[PDB]
């Protein structure tokens, strides 16, 4: 088995991390507009 192992044996990049902590939010979607504040 060792001799057979020696004989026979011897993609899309991920996106950047998005961080938004403690920051306000403006969302302009297709049918409604939103504003999330603190």
């Amino acid at each position: 088995l060792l001799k057979k192992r020696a004989g026979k044996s011897r993609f899309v990049k991920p996106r950047r991390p998005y961080n938004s902590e403690g920051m306000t939010r403006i969302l302009r979607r297709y049918e409604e507009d939103l504003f999330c504040t603190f």
Binding site: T24, R25, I26, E32, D33, L34, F35, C36, T37, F38
Partner: protein, 66 residues
């Protein structure tokens, strides 16, 4: 020469309404701002953008103001 569209008068009400499905981690997610205006021989309530509430709070517009 220019043309200007103007809304002006005394503020009658200022109700920043809140959305049907709020998102977590935030407070008072605003969908629109309804503001009532009163002037001479005429009044009209409006339905404004939620972003203009930030400028309303910035310029300290309260009740009874023009």
């Amino acid at each position: 020469k220019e043309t200007k569209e103007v809304y002006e008068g005394e503020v009658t009400e200022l109700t920043p309404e809140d959305a049907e499905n709020p998102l977590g981690g935030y407070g008072k997610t605003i969908s629109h701002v309804i503001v009532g205006l009163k002037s001479a021989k005429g009044t009209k309530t409006l339905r404004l953008d939620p972003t203009i509430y930030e400028s309303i709070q910035r310029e300290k517009v309260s009740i009874g103001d023009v």
